[PDB]
Design a protein around this ligand. Structure first.
Ligand code: ATP
Ligand code: MG
Lengths: 48, 463, 489
């Protein structure tokens, strides 16, 4: 039982840390994504 | 001399003047026969000026005359604005009559120069134990309020408004940028009911208003606060002034909308190209001159829970203290509800505040962090099963948590208990005594809503 | 001659006119074949105007004439029970509307000094939203969810549940298939809710200008009862389609682009519309009517609806409109498939007005349900490991399961205040601790039907008064005990 505790505890901790890093990546992509479309849209405004 | 509208597209309006008499940037114009005002925003060729109207363009046609004021938007400044509600143009919206002040000031002005800065950094005493001890404020500083609704955000604002006038004989100015009308009415009526309206001046820019109104509503409050600061009483000494910003994120959003309306290449994350400059225009006029000081309290909203977003990133470069309100503490029953571990201040250093204050604050923060680390072990492994020092840390942390709470003065007409303003020295002495261990036998229930330390002793011996 | 021009360009439903020098922004214009247009761009040497109708009959070189008036709609109580286009022309074929007066479509909300605190309740018939997310007269609550997630159902149920309240209702449909609108109208007429409801429809085949101007006309028609002291409710079925139509018009008019190609003035579009749902004070009603009505306060409640793609609430328009409203109701796609038919997510849905918009008995009895739901959210993974917990936590989990199954309800069956009160009282006390987890829905109705047949006086008193005194509590307890003793489910 005690051993399971420790093992399970570790998992939870790891999961928590994992989430954090993913969040960071997500935010980056989000910002990056937006910028791209704007540029393309601006290109359309110059297409005429 | 006079102009005429030549183009109407939404809010953007193009006006044509004479070859010579072309109004400068940021000048204010007024369309005759209508209650419409325009703000110069860009200068083009052939004496054509691109402006944004403060108001609505419905029922407007090309060929209407325009008269130039040859000056920026001027607002009335004085002591007759204490207890009134005005819009961006300084017009009453409370149906209480015209403001008797006859002297006006422009809202566009350069920041004070390099040689006009204060020769030292002096702390500001508020009377709230937790704010003074762990997030000390500075005359000319800036505080960012991170909190949701239902955590007592307005009550704290009113308490600070009362405390400054009671202690430092100062005044306050409130500016609402893009606020809801319902909450504005509620706030005004709460101020009237609590009797703090007399010491404050209020300016509202509504959410249903065009972005031009919401963008230029903070400068009016800034101008009023600046006039309050430089008023010289006998023997000079100026005055200390508070300024309030209901939300600064909406200021940046209004700037973005205005930039998009005028038409220019978007920056990263769709922000306008001139973001940091626009914010530094606002945040560099809030400082402590030789005559007196202005301190600003601003509410900050983080979009998409992203601290890396350009708007909060630009905001955080000017903030000196951060006050965080947590729902967890409010449920626990400890008001005011300010987190003592997520709240930070740049003035908490041994140089500005001293050595003993720094030591006491760091010790309290360390004890709180230790308690935060130990709760989980008690929760899962079990109660007790631990050495004595941990248990002593837990008991002291609980006593400190109870001791942080204090009654306020703006709630006297509701609960009936008088408010307590605690001088810093009393807080320092009480916390040092608690950390020493003298009050290791006093019941913790005497630390709740009890104000100063001696008062704790009296409540304990009475019980 | 300043009141006559010519057409020089026709394309994609937009006509450019050369003339009309004294033409105002938003003024209506008359095309040759009994057609109307709205001006939106006043350039140096041309006027941009959208056509409110079929532009395929317009050709270059035709004439135009300015009306001299802003866009207006007929307003009155004679529009109740009728279906009309965005401009007031009937489409149900039941005859002309005997209009008495007209009102402008673009108007400004009342100032901050004329408002009033929201303290009166509005019922929708759903226990989950009536006890957790109260809606008051003058509030602004938003329903947001993915496709086929239950959004329209809830709006129609809210409209239906005003049978015995005296609140008028306006229903605006934007960019929908005509068959769906016909089915909705038929269902409304079948129940009997069409005796006090107005319907404005702009189908998917209609011009984008109509789909863009429909909600403003609907709000103008709903503002009639606010100024005269009598309450009203308005529902916009999709603001997303209005935003799409606005984007199309702006892009076709060459306004500068932005994130997702939306124009700059898009937040203002919904801001100036949603801010008109307010509760005015008695002084405003006294002044507007010139002393005809005294001591009465008006209101207007709004229930906008927004659709999100794949749950991306971070999009431009959902974020724009979330920051404007006073609350949010979130409907999940996973909960709909899992069997929770109303599919309301508790945990991310909030009401800013709160408990100030409830009756006495509902306000007293909502706390137990809120606490039980919170505790069930706290501990739910322990369902498999129930036997290993102590008695208190196991009891908490069982109570949470019973409560979360009590929230399920069927379509077209609005609950009354007495019904909700009886159900909540039976739950807050220990009465529903013996029934099985799977049979709670059957037990709840049987209990409701036992009342209204043996205790109807009491139900009428609760419905008409809303008070809560020791006497009512005793009657409710005695009735519940009698039902549990004698009848069977
Ligand atoms: N409370 C309910 N209980 C059971 N079924 C329901 C309930 N509410 C809606 N439904 C059904 O689930 C489906 C959802 O349709 P509905 O019109 O409510 O969704 P919607 O969000 O408006 O969709 P759309 O995006 O297609 O307009 C329909 O078949 C409807 O009959
Ligand atoms: Mg739908």
């Amino acid at each position: 039982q005690s051993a399971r505790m420790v093992a399970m505890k570790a998992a939870t901790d790891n999961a928590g840390q994992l989430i954090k890093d993913l969040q960071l990546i997500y935010n980056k992509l989000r910002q990056a994504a937006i910028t791209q479309e704007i540029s393309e849209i601006v290109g359309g405004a110059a297409a005429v | 001399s006079s102009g005429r509208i030549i183009q109407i597209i939404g809010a953007v309006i193009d006006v044509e003047f004479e070859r010579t008499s072309v109004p400068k940037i940021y000048d204010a114009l007024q369309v005759d026969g209508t209650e419409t005002t325009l703000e110069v925003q860009q200068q083009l060729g052939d004496g054509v000026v691109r402006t944004i109207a403060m108001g609505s363009t419905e029922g407007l046609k090309r060929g209407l005359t325009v008269t130039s004021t040859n000056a920026p938007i001027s607002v009335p400044v004085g002591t007759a604005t204490l207890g009134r509600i005005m819009d961006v143009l300084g017009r009453p919206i409370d149906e209480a009559g015209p403001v008797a002040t006859e002297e006006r000031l422009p809202i566009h002005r350069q920041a004070p120069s390099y040689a006009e800065q204060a020769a030292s950094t002096d702390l500001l005493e508020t009377g709230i134990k937790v704010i003074d001890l762990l997030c000390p404020f500075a005359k000319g500083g800036k505080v960012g309020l991170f909190g949701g609704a239902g955590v007592g955000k307005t009550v704290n604002m009113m308490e600070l408004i009362n405390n400054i006038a009671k202690a430092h004989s100062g005044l306050s100015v409130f500016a609402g940028v893009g606020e809801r009308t319902r909450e504005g009415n509620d706030f005004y009526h709460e101020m009237k009911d609590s009797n703090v309206l007399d010491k404050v001046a209020m300016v509202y820019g509504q959410m249903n208003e065009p972005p031009g109104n919401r963008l230029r509503v903070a400068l009016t409050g800034l101008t009023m606060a600046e006039y309050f600061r430089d008023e010289k009483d006998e023997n000079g000494k100026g005055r200390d002034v508070l300024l309030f910003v209901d939300n600064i994120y909406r200021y940046t959003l209004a700037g973005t909308e205005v930039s998009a309306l005028l038409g220019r290449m978007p920056s990263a994350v769709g922000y306008q190209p001139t973001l940091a400059e626009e914010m530094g225009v606002l945040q560099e006029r809030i400082t402590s001159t030789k005559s007196g000081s202005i301190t600003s309290i601003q509410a900050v909203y983080v979009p998409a829970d992203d601290l890396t977003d350009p708007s909060p990133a630009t905001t955080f470069a000017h903030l000196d203290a951060t006050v965080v309100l947590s729902r967890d503490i409010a449920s626990s029953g400890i008001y005011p509800a300010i987190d003592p571990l997520d709240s930070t201040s740049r003035q908490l250093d041994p140089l500005v505040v001293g050595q003993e204050h720094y030591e006491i604050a760091r010790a309290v923060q360390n004890v709180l962090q230790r308690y935060k680390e130990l709760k989980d072990i008690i929760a899962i492994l079990g109660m007790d099963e631990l050495a004595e020092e941990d248990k002593l840390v837990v008991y002291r942390a609980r006593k400190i948590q109870r001791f942080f709470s204090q009654p306020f003065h703006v709630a006297e007409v509701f609960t009936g208990a008088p408010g307590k303003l605690v001088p810093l020295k009393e807080t320092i002495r009480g916390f040092k005594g608690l950390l020493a261990g003298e009050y290791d036998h006093i019941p913790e229930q005497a630390f709740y809503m009890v104000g100063g330390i001696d008062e704790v002793i009296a409540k304990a011996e009475k019980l | 001659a300043k009141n006559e021009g010519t057409i020089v360009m026709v394309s994609d439903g937009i006509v450019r006119i050369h003339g009309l020098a004294d033409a105002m922004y938003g003024e209506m214009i008359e095309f040759d074949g009994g057609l109307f247009g709205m001006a939106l761009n006043l350039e140096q040497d041309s006027v941009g105007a959208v056509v409110l109708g079929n532009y395929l009959s317009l050709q270059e070189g035709q004439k135009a004439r300015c009306t001299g008036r802003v866009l207006e709609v007929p307003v009155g109580p004679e529009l109740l029970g009728r279906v009309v286009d965005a401009l007031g022309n009937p489409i149900d074929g039941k005859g002309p509307i005997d209009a008495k007066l007209t009102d402008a479509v673009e108007k400004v909300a009342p100032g901050v000094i004329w408002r009033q605190s929201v303290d009166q309740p509005v019922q929708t018939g759903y226990k989950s939203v009536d006890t957790m997310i109260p809606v008051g007269r003058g509030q602004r609550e938003l329903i947001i969810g993915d496709r086929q997630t239950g959004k329209t159902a809830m709006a129609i149920d809210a409209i239906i549940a005003q049978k015995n309240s005296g609140i008028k209702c306006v229903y605006v449909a934007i960019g929908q298939k005509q068959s769906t609108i016909a089915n909705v109208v038929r269902k409304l007429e079948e129940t009997g809710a069409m005796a006090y409801t107005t319907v404005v429809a702009a189908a998917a085949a209609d011009p984008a200008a109509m789909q863009y101007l429909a909600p403003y006309s609907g709000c103008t028609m709903g503002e009639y009862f606010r100024d005269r002291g009598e309450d009203a409710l308005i529902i916009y079925d999709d603001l997303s389609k209005q935003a799409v139509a606005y984007r199309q018009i702006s892009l076709l008019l060459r306004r500068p682009p932005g994130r997702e190609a939306y124009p700059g003035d898009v937040f203002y579009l919904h801001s100036r519309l949603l801010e008109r749902a307010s509760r005015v004070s008695a002084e405003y009603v006294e002044k507007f009517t010139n002393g005809a009505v005294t001591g009465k306060t008006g209101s207007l409640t709004a229930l906008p609806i927004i659709e999100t793609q794949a749950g991306d609430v971070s999009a431009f328009v959902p974020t724009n409109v979330i920051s404007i409203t006073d609350g949010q109701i979130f409907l999940e796609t996973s909960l709909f498939n899992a069997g929770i038919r109303p599919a309301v997510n508790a945990g991310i849905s909030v009401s800013r007005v709160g408990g100030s918009a409830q009756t006495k008995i509902i306000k007293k009895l909502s706390g137990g349900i809120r606490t039980a739901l919170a505790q069930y959210r706290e501990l739910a993974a322990f369902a498999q490991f129930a036997s290993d917990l102590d008695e208190a936590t196991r009891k908490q989990l069982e109570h949470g399961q019973r409560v979360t199954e009590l929230m399920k309800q069927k379509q077209y069956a609005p609950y009354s205040i007495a019904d909700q009160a009886v159900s909540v009282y039976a739950s807050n006390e220990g009465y529903m601790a013996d029934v099985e987890v799977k049979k709670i829905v059957d037990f709840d109705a049987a209990l409701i039907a036992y009342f209204r047949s043996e205790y109807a006086p009491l139900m009428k008193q609760i419905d008409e008064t809303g008070d809560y005194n020791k006497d009512i509590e005793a009657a409710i307890k005695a009735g519940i005990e009698s039902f549990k003793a004698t009848q069977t489910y």
